[PDB]
Amino acid sequence: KMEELFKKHKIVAVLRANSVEEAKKKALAVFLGGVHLIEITFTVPDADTVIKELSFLKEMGAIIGAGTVTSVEQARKAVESGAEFIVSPHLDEEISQFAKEKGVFYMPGVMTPTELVKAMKLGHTILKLFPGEVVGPQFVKAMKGPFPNVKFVPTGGVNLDNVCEWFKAGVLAVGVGSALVKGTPVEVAEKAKAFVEKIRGC
Secondary structure, three states: OHHHHHHHHOOOEEEOOOOOOHHHHHHHHHHHHOOOEEEEEOOOOOHHHHHHHHHHHHHHOOEEEEEOOOOHHHHHHHHHOOOOEEEOOOOOHHHHHHHHHHOOEEEOEOOOHHHHHHHHOOOOOOOEOOOOOOOOOOOOOOOOOOOOOOOEOOOOOOOOOOOOOOOOOOEOOOOEOOOOOOOOHHHHHHHHHHHHHHHHHO
């Protein structure tokens, strides 16, 4: 499921907006840009309500899932409001077991090999390289040797100049944020079409 969706689409989107309207406007803008994967991070107030309202974009063909889920109650709200996947910045055994029971694709974040191996010993083989500005481009490549069976989703410090410089190193789907979602929807929606063409280029 989610694994092959990620492999096929090749980009996610982490939306951080302050109102509960500018969320919907930028969700629509990125959709028209070409991005079918949308992540509603719970820093947006009533982000469960925002997912519930964007429900109609699942019909047109988008994928709406939570983000920055740091507690079991937040995971409860996300899975109730129809989020298709969960994303946290840190490992959480409790959230992992809950998502295992409920059958929801959970994608924890890892920074160092101890965290990484603690993850792999629990089942999640592809994780979130938070942050890909500190750890860098040469961490996933330098760590293909020891572990060649894990694939990363480098959510941090991603832009035009090094968007497929991480695809060359073997990442799945570079989750992007503030490079996209910044400005009027007519610019958010036109600047997503420059990442999607560049990812589809390399």
